[PDB]
Structure 1
Amino acid sequence: MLERQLGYYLIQLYIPSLLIVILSWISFWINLDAAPARVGLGITTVLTLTTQSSGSRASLPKVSYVKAIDIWLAVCLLFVFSALLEYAAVNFVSRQREFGGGGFIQRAKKIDKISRIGFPLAFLIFNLFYWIIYKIVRREDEFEHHHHHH
């Protein structure tokens, strides 16, 4: 009966897991092909830390199991959502690159638009998980703290 003490490891583990996510796009501007090595390494570190995180949840996956489903069923979709619209936009441009893909050579000169939409999208997420993490521990894990409100 030590599931309420798991959130502590999820809080300190979420900090870095959330930071690496923001850098994903910020670095995807060039890692999109120029150097995806950084995108393939960080993406494997997040999926590996999430699949293994369920290892310590064998004690009693009831309280944290449900709370983990509310966060595990939105992140993977939200991250792949904004990334799916971009990978589908460039392909929807002509709807048939097989017809005339010779004009892609002049596409390497991107305006880094990924940063334009990623700026407000990254700040919103960082503040969305920071205000929800320091709040959840209070309006859910209050019994864990003593004097500290947050």
Structure 2
Amino acid sequence: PMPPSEFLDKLMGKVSGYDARIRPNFKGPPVNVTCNIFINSFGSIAETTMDYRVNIFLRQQWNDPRLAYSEYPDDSLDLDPSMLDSIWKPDLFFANEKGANFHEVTTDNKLLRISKNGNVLYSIRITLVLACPMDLKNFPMDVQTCIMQLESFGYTMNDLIFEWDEKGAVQVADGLTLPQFILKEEKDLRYCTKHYNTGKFTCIEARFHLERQMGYYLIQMYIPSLLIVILSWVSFWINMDAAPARVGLGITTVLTMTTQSSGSRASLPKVSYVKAIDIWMAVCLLFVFSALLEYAAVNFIARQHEEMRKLFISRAKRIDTVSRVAFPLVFLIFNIFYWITYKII
């Protein structure tokens, strides 16, 4: 017969009256475009910029009755990406792009297949820099949700309708990890249907649930700040008259709590509100601060000064034995109330 390249030029030439600027079923029912994505890459989840980049295969399927044929023998055709300007394609865009591009290395990474009844499969490769706003109030113990929504730009709801297909709407590649999160295998799929002053525009979205890993912040930040508060309680087991040994241990403990905290603020994100790790670094600073002021009272009671002089020594030995039990108890009450209120969420 004739080659498929010359048949598609016959099917969409100046003859037969095809126009790429006109949607199929024009002045009729709306075009139903069904979509699914294949995620190749996922990551660089930035938090100062509040975005993440993803690398997808965007597959679209619609019906175009002007592209139906019966004369060519084979049941499917494929159009070269150079001749792709002569197809009505949907004006899909991502409502939170924040930057995107195509891939055009060795060939345009684009695909088109026109079936015999007029079904059109259109698959392109996109790198997106999609934006998701992030809530770092409980920073190591947080769960993030980053959406991916797909609108139509120029056609309203009565002309073009997007849907997820009912067989695998979001696939993810196999060997795909993240430096700080894990990606759950549960994708919410829902409609949004944007309303502007311009009109009703269709949109569908896919949600991705991210759970931050914990093991670095425990070993590097929670456990070392825990041991410094234990070292601040060694002062209560050292006797009263060892005045360089008590304020030396008292201030070199608040210095190593300051060094532990200031050295780790470079690894933390740069939001301007209080996180959950920031409460821990500040409450553990109070337990080291309050253990020097304990000895400030003990050194002051034991110098006020006969049967009266043994009362002030007995009074200062009392508070040294109260705080020997009370500070591992008050810090335990905080250590229960901290981890319950950040694992109840």
| TM-score, L = length of structure 2 | 0.29
| TM-score, L = length of structure 1 | 0.54
Does 1:129 find its partner at 2:335? Answer: yes
Given that residues 25 and 114 in structure 1 are in contact (C-alpha distance below 8 angstroms), is that contact kept between their aligned partners in structure 2? no
Find the residue that maps to 1:35 and give its secondary structure.
Answer: helix
Q: 1:126 corresponds to which letter in structure 2?
A: L
Query: Shift in Å at residue 50 of structure 1?
Result: 0.7
User: Structure 2 CA distance, aligned partners of 1:89 and 1:45?
Assistant: 23
RMSD over aligned Cα, in angstroms?
A: 4.0
Does 1:14 find its partner at 2:222? Answer: yes
Does 1:24 find its partner at 2:206? Answer: no
Structure with the larger RCO, 1 or 2 (CA within 8 Å, 6+ apart)? 1
Does 1:67 find its partner at 2:276? Answer: yes
User: Structure 1 CA distance, aligned partners of 2:297 and 2:331?
Assistant: 23
- The 3 A distance-change label for structure 1 pair 74 and 132 is closer
Given that residues 253 and 288 in structure 2 are in contact (C-alpha distance below 8 angstroms), is that contact kept between their aligned partners in structure 1? no
Report which of the two has the higher share of strand. Answer: 2
Quote the residue 1:35 is aligned against: 245
- Structure 2: stretches of 5+ with no match in the other structure: 1-45, 48-138, 141-211
The percentage of aligned residue pairs carrying the same residue is: 21
Q: 1:122 corresponds to which letter in structure 2?
A: P
Given that residues 28 and 39 in structure 1 are in contact (C-alpha distance below 8 angstroms), is that contact kept between their aligned partners in structure 2? no
Find the residue that maps to 2:238 and give its secondary structure.
Answer: helix
Quote the residue 1:76 is aligned against: 285
Asked which structure has the greater CA Rg, the reply is 2
Q: 1:91 corresponds to which letter in structure 2?
A: F
Quote the residue 2:117 is aligned against: none
Given that residues 225 and 257 in structure 2 are in contact (C-alpha distance below 8 angstroms), is that contact kept between their aligned partners in structure 1? yes
User: Structure 2 CA distance, aligned partners of 1:38 and 1:89?
Assistant: 15
Quote the residue 1:55 is aligned against: 266
- The 3 A distance-change label for structure 1 pair 76 and 6 is farther
Report which of the two has the higher share of helix. Answer: 1
User: Structure 1 CA distance, aligned partners of 2:237 and 2:258?
Assistant: 21
User: Structure 1 CA distance, aligned partners of 2:244 and 2:333?
Assistant: 30
- Structure 1: stretches of 5+ with no match in the other structure: 141-150
Given that residues 26 and 115 in structure 1 are in contact (C-alpha distance below 8 angstroms), is that contact kept between their aligned partners in structure 2? no
Query: Shift in Å at residue 127 of structure 1?
Result: 4.7
Number of aligned pairs? Answer: 127
Find the residue that maps to 1:66 and give its secondary structure.
Answer: coil
Query: Shift in Å at residue 91 of structure 1?
Result: 3.0
User: Structure 1 CA distance, aligned partners of 2:282 and 2:293?
Assistant: 17
User: Structure 1 CA distance, aligned partners of 2:249 and 2:294?
Assistant: 21
User: Structure 1 CA distance, aligned partners of 2:281 and 2:319?
Assistant: 28
